[PDB]
Amino acid sequence: SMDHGMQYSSIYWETSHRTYLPFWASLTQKFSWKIMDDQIRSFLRLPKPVTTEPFVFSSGSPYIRRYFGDADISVPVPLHAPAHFAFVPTGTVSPWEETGMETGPQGAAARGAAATAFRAVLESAWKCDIDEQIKEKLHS
Amino acid sequence: TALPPPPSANVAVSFTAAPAEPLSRGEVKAASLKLELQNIERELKDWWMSRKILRDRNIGLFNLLQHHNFAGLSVNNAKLSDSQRVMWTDLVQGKPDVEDKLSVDAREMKVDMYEKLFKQAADLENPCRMPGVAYLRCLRDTLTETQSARRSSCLNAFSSFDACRTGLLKQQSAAVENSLVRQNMADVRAKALFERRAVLLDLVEGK
Amino acid sequence: TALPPPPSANVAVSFTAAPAEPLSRGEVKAASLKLELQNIERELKDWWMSRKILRDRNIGLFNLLQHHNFAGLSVNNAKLSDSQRVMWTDLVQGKPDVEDKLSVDAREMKVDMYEKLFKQAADLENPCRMPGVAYLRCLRDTLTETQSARRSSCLNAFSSFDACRTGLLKQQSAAVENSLVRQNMADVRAKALFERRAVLLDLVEGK
Amino acid sequence: MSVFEARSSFLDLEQCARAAGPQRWEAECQGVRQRALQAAADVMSRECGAYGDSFFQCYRHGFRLEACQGEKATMQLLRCQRMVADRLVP
Amino acid sequence: SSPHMDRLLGDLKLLAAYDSAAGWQEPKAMESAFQSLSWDDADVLKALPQYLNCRGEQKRRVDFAYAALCPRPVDEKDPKQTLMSLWMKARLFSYDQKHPFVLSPFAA
Amino acid sequence: AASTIPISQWPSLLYAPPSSPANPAVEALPEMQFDDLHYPRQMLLCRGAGYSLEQCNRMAQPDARVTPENPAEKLLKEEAVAAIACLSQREGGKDEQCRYYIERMYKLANKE
Amino acid sequence: AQLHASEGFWDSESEQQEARLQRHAEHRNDLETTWEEALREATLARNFDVLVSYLNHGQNGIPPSVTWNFNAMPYGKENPDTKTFPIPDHEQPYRAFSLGFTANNLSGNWGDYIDRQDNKNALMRPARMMFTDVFIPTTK
Amino acid sequence: AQLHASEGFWDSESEQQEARLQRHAEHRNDLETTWEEALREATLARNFDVLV
Amino acid sequence: VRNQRYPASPVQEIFLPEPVPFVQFDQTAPSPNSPPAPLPSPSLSQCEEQKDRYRDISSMFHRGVAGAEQVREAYNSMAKCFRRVSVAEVLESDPAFRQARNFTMDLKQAEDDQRYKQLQYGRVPSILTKYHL
Amino acid sequence: PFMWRQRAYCAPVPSAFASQQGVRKPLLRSNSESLSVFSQIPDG
Amino acid sequence: SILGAEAFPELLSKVPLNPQMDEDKHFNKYKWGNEPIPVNRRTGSRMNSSIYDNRNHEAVRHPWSTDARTFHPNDNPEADRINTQYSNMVSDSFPEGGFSDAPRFSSNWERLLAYHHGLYSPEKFNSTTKTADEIRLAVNDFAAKVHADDPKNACKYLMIEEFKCLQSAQARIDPQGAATKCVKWFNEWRQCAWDQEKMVKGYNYIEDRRARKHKPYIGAPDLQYS
Amino acid sequence: NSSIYDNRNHEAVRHPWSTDARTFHPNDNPEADRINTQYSNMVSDSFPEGGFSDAPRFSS
Ligand SMILES: CCCCCCCCCCCCCCCCCC(=O)OC[C@H](COP(=O)([O-])OCC(O)COP(=O)([O-])OC[C@@H](COC(=O)CCCCCCCCCCCCCCCCC)OC(=O)CCCCCCCCCCCCCCCCC)OC(=O)CCCCCCCCCCCCCCCCC
Ligand SMILES: CCCCCCCCCCCCCCCCCC(=O)OC[C@H](COP(=O)([O-])OCC(O)COP(=O)([O-])OC[C@@H](COC(=O)CCCCCCCCCCCCCCCCC)OC(=O)CCCCCCCCCCCCCCCCC)OC(=O)CCCCCCCCCCCCCCCCC
Ligand SMILES: CCCCCCCCCCCCO[C@@H]1O[C@H](CO)[C@@H](O[C@H]2O[C@H](CO)[C@@H](O)[C@H](O)[C@H]2O)[C@H](O)[C@H]1O
Ligand SMILES: CCCCCCCCCCCCO[C@@H]1O[C@H](CO)[C@@H](O[C@H]2O[C@H](CO)[C@@H](O)[C@H](O)[C@H]2O)[C@H](O)[C@H]1O
Ligand SMILES: CCCCCCCCCCCCO[C@@H]1O[C@H](CO)[C@@H](O[C@H]2O[C@H](CO)[C@@H](O)[C@H](O)[C@H]2O)[C@H](O)[C@H]1O
């Protein structure tokens, strides 16, 4: 329901805003010297742009120009089928699995050294308390 | 209440912590135990959540029925009038019949009350509706008569009505019994799973 | 493909079909067997769906990597150029070093190629990136020298590089082994569950 | 590292203490003592890590979260430790 | 019956409270915290001068733990912050010299 | 007075925080570090060298690349010990019982 | 522009999420139907190899991990999500100037090409017609 | 008219369905949180009566 | 509920804002030129009410009509009374604290000292030392 | 090159994950090209 | 034997850990009181933001059932925000405890499939906001690694700044919103890469002669630019 | 959804479970000749004979 829409906003001209168009503007028309310049260059053998040559020296990898019906409209296209490399081992990561909940080195490392250190500190304090309890129990 | 999410590393660990040596027999057995534990916990959660949801829903239904002052085959309502209770107990357990002491107009009124009550109680999908309505229609036909002469004519319909009635009662009893049995079996199974999980946690290994 | 939905009654059955008598011992045992069967089927479905999804995803990843012409620590790519393959095998397994036969400009070019390749291969999260870049920087510093004089200076960094390298290799091997073991255990468990379900279906009762 | 192992370690400790005596136990039973404490510590970590991580998170966030309100963040951890001790040492 | 654990958790709570009161501009609350920060522990008092002179692996362990707990560098001019830091480090040093720390995830 | 800090000014808020009664060392905030990859990297390097897990765990050491230590703990040692003694004896310095030592330390550290 | 549309660049985050959900749901339904079929066949045959063989009855590549869209790009004269370093005034452009006894362009602001605003203030917006030499109303 | 609005009479089927879904989700989350808490307590106490 | 720092916010903030407070000490009172006098050495002769009230409240809690806050309060009072003598023993025995006890210094020497030049934080080593490069 | 799942502007286009397609068009393209005007259109 | 005797000094000495606890337990040690953080800012769900989206200000849809009550950012904040630290600022744009749209998967294959289709990541769903200290630690580690990678690089601080802005905007839990902020530093890094390359490999162009009206006015100074 | 006074009109109905959002489209521009005018062929213009494709498979 987007095509053929109604006029949603109003069209108007504010009082005394200028138009910058004379009465012969409709008979006026545009012009570019580019076509004539190209003809003259071709006839006088003037320096040509490098876009006339399909091969591209502007990079190290091979590029070839694809032309759209004219030498003025071109795009470079790479020829290489680039080989990519990964200095990575396979099967070393399972991102879907939450690893902070599983017990193990991978779990602690998905957690952090701060949490592991805190756990170790709690462990040490608990061991101190339990050693005191063991002493007071076995001395009896 | 819930716990806060667990802490995560600030620096990115991609694979640096991955093991550089294959697992051992004890670690494999520990992994198997972990899987068994998670399966047990899944079963326990299913049982517990089903039990909780059903209990809550049924207590809510009971409170709603008590709020709207409902009465069923098991007459367990204290806010009932004695007359309404007598009429409902006659429809459920006894025999609806008009007394000879009443005038014909009062008999018509009593039969209309019976019919209104029973039609509001039983819908078209209910099996006992047709027998009940037939019996009450026979009563309407035999208003200007005595109970002795009305029995011979209305018995053939009261029989079917009482049959459907007793069928519903037996259905209710059997439902209660079967639900109790199933519930108890499920609870026993859950308890056994809990003890199995306890022993597996005593045997688990790791840190 | 799927089956069509099962047929439903046209006339409304509300409770007319409910049992009017409590269940029996055999029926209770059959219900217990049905519950066991459904649990077994749930476990089997979990195993099968996980296996299927993982297989599909990993085959798709392999096809994508083959389509984009990727090469990893296990050099299993046939569309590689011999020069690229030599360079990658030196970065993974051998020792990157510039030959004395080359001119200084060609040595600089070779080191730049090594650096570009290794930086595209290893990201900042990778552990071996810093040792590799340090070794290549030492090479850049020691271009105008012989291999004999360059070894004494670059060995201290090549050691760390080779250590990280071998660590990654061991990680990959251990991952393969552990995944195989876990997969085989899961498949054996699924097969056992299937046989248990078969015997329970031979014992099931009802119609 | 497991409850069974920790209980066996504590039994070894107690029997070696009964063998040595109340005067030379602290000098003759150090290795068994350390092993028992380490096993009990592994058990405590495994069974109370969640609560420790929760307290760590609350401390990081200044006890501004919902689960950090009140004293449960601490009482849960203390109760877990007490339960582990009462299950191991006696 | 768990004094070490209790006082550790209390000191952590009081550090958090001091930080919050500083953020909210509350001298009364932050001084209350500083005063309640368990200054009457003989063990930590006796370990303080030992930590002030320790060196090597023990010091590195204690500093690693203190960076895990309180990684923010306190202002070198605030004696209250300096003293609370010293007290926490001395407590950790006492715990470590009684039962050393095991900070690595890999262990057996 | 204290106006809201939009989300676009948070990176500067992290390394140039506003003034508080308990400020950190802003000049040292870029030096606060705590590596979560220390032990994983150590183990990886050792296993690549060829050591076993036990040898790696015995050779492991805690990270030295952590937040630097406060120089006050070495320069104001005696004054800090005296202040801590005063606190331990006077219940944390309630009703200004360690103002003496605290002010001596503050002067030594600030110098107007 | 059509190439961008194939990649979902002009789509919103809601539309991207809905497409992702649609793929998820189709895949899930296919999987569950295949499981039902496989289980039925393996039950009537009493063999596990049938279940195993049903694992390859359906792998081109993978779904994209992340997506980028046009609405995620920031815009705004005051929006600090576009400000890295101040642009010098001798490089910033000028706004048009119109001033006369009859009309001006200083009593209002029309805005940018994207973020437009009404030039008239609230009190005279209901009387916009009165500030125009010509007015073409909406279609409704 | 305000009474009708309390009962959701002026609301559309989409809005009714969304409210229904919202109730469903709140209830589900409450249930799962309560289950996690109950399981933790019953595991630290090793007793089924706590779950009950 | 908030007690605004600037009730006349549009006007007060401009010409009389609030400064960052100073918490090390009051700063409005004179500076003592002498240390505190050594308090009398304590002993267990002052734990009477603490011990007896802790016993009473623990008994009443075992009954179930006391509570836990009272128990904690009483136990902490008693523990403070004991920590007093523990700390006194530590201070009087350990030699490292004798200097701290007989420590004395004046604001003039404090201002004349020059240790504040060396209060600069260090620099964390390079991350290459992890790989030993 | 550090936070790939969080930096989608530096990620490949969804047509690259598909494993299917004189000289051919490149198989791998990024979304960062959207930040260039003459990346796809010509400079004619 | 009572539990936790020496562990609640906050309770024994009426020390509040925050103005909320102060107001609750009636300690009254916060001179400025407390302005409660409402529930819509304490918790909530992820929402669509752009005005060029039809479902704007609506909760994000997931494969799982989710509470659709959204987190509302602070759009009309009070003039005085006494605590201008990151702790109190982050609550205006994210909930500290994370969003309330996390799933509890009934099975592992559902999790697998969600991840495979790009609808779930634990890094994104089971997590809290990052504290300023954590952000700084991460940024400083990344900066050290980049410096070790290459000191004589010009785009180094630009890469560090995009990393910093991502971390500050919490890209772990709001990746799209954070990229919306950091793409500018990415673009600057791209430009710096080209500039460094053209300085290394000498790349220049023939500049044309000076234009006849390079100066708008003869009396104007023509400041020379490299 | 069907009503024009609904904002999500012509959009699939949302359920607690994941559902394919491709909707059944009624026959709005039917051909003049509908040779079979039996209920069998008429019902397909407003409902799918095999039912809708939004059925759940509950995990529990
Ligand atoms: C109180 C203050 C006092 C102090 C003063 C203070 C100020 C001092 C400074 C001076 C002011 C400077 C201010 C800054 C100016 C900037 C703004 C500006 O200038 O432009 C704004 C304004 C903005 O317009 P715009 O929308 O932006 O469009 C801009 C375009 O560029 C232009 O738009 P355009 O091109 O569309 O408009 C041109 C227009 C007019 O252009 C012309 O006509 C060209 C001029 C020719 C003039 C000579 C011909 C006169 C013929 C008279 C004979 C009539 C019959 C006699 C009857 C007698 C009885 C009544 O063209 C037409 O409309 C159609 C005519 C086409 C034919 C023209 C050529 C043929 C001419 C011969 C006729 C032949 C007919 C044959 C028909 C076919 C038969 C087969 O520009 C204009 O409006 C331009 C026209 C202005 C005309 C104003 C009408 C009044 C003229 C009298 C002025 C006062 C006279 C004083 C006494 C002297 C006379 C006696
Ligand atoms: C960061 C700091 C920055 C700070 C700021 C810095 C600022 C920048 C730097 C500034 C540096 C300083 C530079 C100096 C200041 C710049 C000023 C400037 O450039 O101006 C720009 C600015 C315009 O720029 P703009 O961007 O284009 O603005 C928009 C357009 O203006 C919009 O155009 P519009 O749509 O509104 O249309 C206007 C229309 C307006 O057209 C009319 O008003 C004409 C109406 C005539 C009606 C009666 C005509 C009767 C004639 C009949 C002829 C025979 C029949 C022929 C039939 C066809 C002709 C009708 O067209 C014209 O304007 C025509 C102008 C050209 C003709 C001029 C005629 C001059 C004759 C003078 C006569 C003197 C008599 C003296 C006798 C003394 C008494 C004894 O100036 C204006 O304000 C424009 C209006 C100017 C007023 C002209 C009014 C002339 C009326 C003459 C009536 C004579 C009747 C006498 C009767 C009394 C005796 C009985
Ligand atoms: C060179 C100076 C001398 C020549 C003067 C030229 C004409 C002066 C222009 C008209 C002055 C009054 O302009 C009137 O106030 C401002 C102008 O920005 C506009 O007001 C509008 O923009 C302002 C921005 O500042 C907003 O605060 C206001 O909410 C909005 O309505 C009105 O729409 C306009 O009607
Ligand atoms: C005795 C020496 C001669 C005395 C007379 C000097 C007259 C010079 C003024 C003429 C106008 C020059 O205006 C402008 O300046 C210089 C030339 O001067 C040119 O500038 C351009 O060409 C000159 C070559 O000489 C380059 O050095 C310069 O880098 C380039 O920008 C412009 O193309 C010209 O447009
Ligand atoms: C049928 C008969 C046809 C007659 C043909 C007559 C041809 C006449 C051609 C003259 C063209 C000159 O064109 C103009 O000249 C001047 C100097 O001369 C050039 O040079 C001028 O501009 C450029 C830069 O803008 C610089 O060189 C310099 O600043 C200035 O000298 C202009 O760039 C050029 O646009």
Numbering used by the authors:
A (entry chain e): 164 to 303
B (entry chain L), C (entry chain l): 2 to 208
D (entry chain i): 146 to 235
E (entry chain p): 15 to 122
F (entry chain g): 115 to 226
G (entry chain d): 156 to 213, 229 to 310
H (entry chain D): 156 to 207
I (entry chain q): 2 to 134
From the study:
F-type ATP synthases are energy-converting membrane protein complexes that synthesize adenosine triphosphate (ATP) from ADP and inorganic phosphate. These universal enzymes function by using the energy stored in an electrochemical potential across the bioenergetic membrane by rotary catalysis. In mitochondria, F1Fo ATP synthase resides in the crista membrane where it is known to form dimers, which can further assemble into rows critical for inducing the membrane curvature and maintaining membrane potential and morphology. Here, we investigate the mechanism for the generation of the unique cristae in the Apicomplexa, using a combination of single-particle cryo-EM, cryo-ET and subtomogram averaging.
The enlarged T. gondii Fo subcomplex differs markedly in its overall architecture from other ATP synthase structures. It displays distinct structural features including a peripheral matrix-exposed part that we term ‘wing’ region and a 360-kDa lumenal region. The Fo periphery contains several compact folds, including three coiled-coil-helix-coiled-coil-helix domain (CHCHD) containing proteins ATPTG7-9; a thioredoxin-like fold in ATPTG4; and ubiquitin-like fold in subunit-k. The dimerization interface in the membrane and lumenal regions is governed by homotypic interactions between symmetry-related subunits, most of which extend deep into both monomers. Subunit-b contains two transmembrane helices, each binds one of the symmetry-related subunit-a copies, which are therefore linked by four transmembrane helices. In addition, two cardiolipins are found on the matrix side, forming specific protein-lipid interactions bridging the two copies of subunit-b and subunit-f. This cardiolipin pair is sequestered in the Fo subcomplex with no apparent path to the bulk membrane, suggesting a structural role. An additional 15 cardiolipins and 12 other phospholipids were found to mediate a network of interactions throughout the membrane region. We traced two cavities in the Fo subcomplex corresponding to the proton half-channels on the lumenal and matrix sides. Taken together, both half-channels are partially lined by apicomplexan-specific subunits resulting in a divergent structure and likely the involvement of different residues in proton translocation compared to structures from other organisms.
